[PDB]
Amino acid sequence: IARTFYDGPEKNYEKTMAILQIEAEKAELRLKELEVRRLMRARGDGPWYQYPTIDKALIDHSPKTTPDN
Amino acid sequence: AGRIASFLKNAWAKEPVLVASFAIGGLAIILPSLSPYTNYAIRINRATPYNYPVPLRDDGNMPDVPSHPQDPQGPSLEWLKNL
Numbered sequence: 001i002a003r004t005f006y007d008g009p010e011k012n013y014e015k016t017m018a019i020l021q022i023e024a025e026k027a028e029l030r031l032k033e034l035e036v037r038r039l040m041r042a043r044g045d046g047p048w049y050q051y052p053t054i055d056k057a058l059i060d061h062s063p064k065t066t067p068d069n
Numbered sequence: 070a071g072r073i074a075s076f077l078k079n080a081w082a083k084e085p086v087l088v089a090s091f092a093i094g095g096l097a098i099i100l101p102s103l104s105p106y107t108n109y110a111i112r113i114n115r116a117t118p119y120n121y122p123v124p125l126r127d128d129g130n131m132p133d134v135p136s137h138p139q140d141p142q143g144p145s146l147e148w149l150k151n152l
């Protein structure tokens with residue numbers, strides 16, 4: 001029965017190790033991702049949460065009938 | 070060819086006001102695109118000095134900019150007087 005239907009304990013042992021490594025890395029990635037989102041939303045210095053401002057190319061830099069702009 | 074002629078004859082007989090209105094509106098739409106004086110109107114509009122012409126600082130590299138209004142360089146309104 002063991003020879004025909006099953007494998008040795010090493011396969012399950014090392015598959016468990018691989019699965020555990022993947023799961024732990026995903027957990028730490030999720031925690032880091034939440035922290036990064038919080039910091040970016042608080043400070044606004046990252047690529048995320050970049051809310052639009054007025055484009056400066058719309059300004060007209062020509063004389064304006066009056067010296068004082 | 071002959072159908073439109075009969076339709077125009079009927080419209081002129083029954084509703085001359087609408088015929089005249091359509092003819093005048095069509096001329097108003099089409100004639101400006103074929104007139105050589107539209108560009109003259111644009112040039113006349115651009116020749117009206119509403120605001121002050123602010124002078125440019127001389128940098129020693131402005132051969133086409135006048136140093137005085139009566140200097141030959143700059144735009145000329147000779148074409149406007151003879152119009």
Ligand SMILES: CCCCCCCCCCCCCCCCC[C@@H](O)O[C@H](CO[C@H](O)CCCCCCCCCCCCCCC)COP(=O)(O)OCC[N+](C)(C)C
Nearest residue numbers: 001002003004005006007008009010011012013014015016
């Ligand atoms: C000497 C007398 C006493 C002997 C009694 C022996 C007791 C065993 C008999 C009971 C049958 C066991 C139940 C089957 C469950 C096994 C399912 C699974 O585990 O088997 C797969 C293997 O598949 C097997 O072929 C299972 C087939 C069993 C199908 C049962 C059907 C029997 C129904 C009878 C119908 C008869 C005719 C009907 C007429 C209408 C494993 O997949 P695999 O990943 O590859 O194997 C990994 C191990 N390796 C790497 C070493 C290969």
Ligand SMILES: CCCCCCCC/C=C\CCCCCCCC(=O)O[C@H](COC(=O)CCCCCCC/C=C/CCCCCCCC)COP(=O)(O)OCCN
Nearest residue numbers: 077079080083084087088089090091092093094095096098
């Ligand atoms: C391309 C330029 C277009 C813009 C210019 C037009 C400016 C405004 C003119 C249009 C104003 C609104 C028009 C309203 C249309 C009226 C439709 C209608 O109902 O017509 C019938 C009448 O039928 C007609 O429309 C009359 C004949 C068809 C329309 C008129 C002629 C269409 C164009 C003809 C001239 C084309 C250019 C002139 C060519 C000259 C020869 C080279 C109305 O009569 P009823 O009140 O129902 O009768 C009850 C009482 N008896």
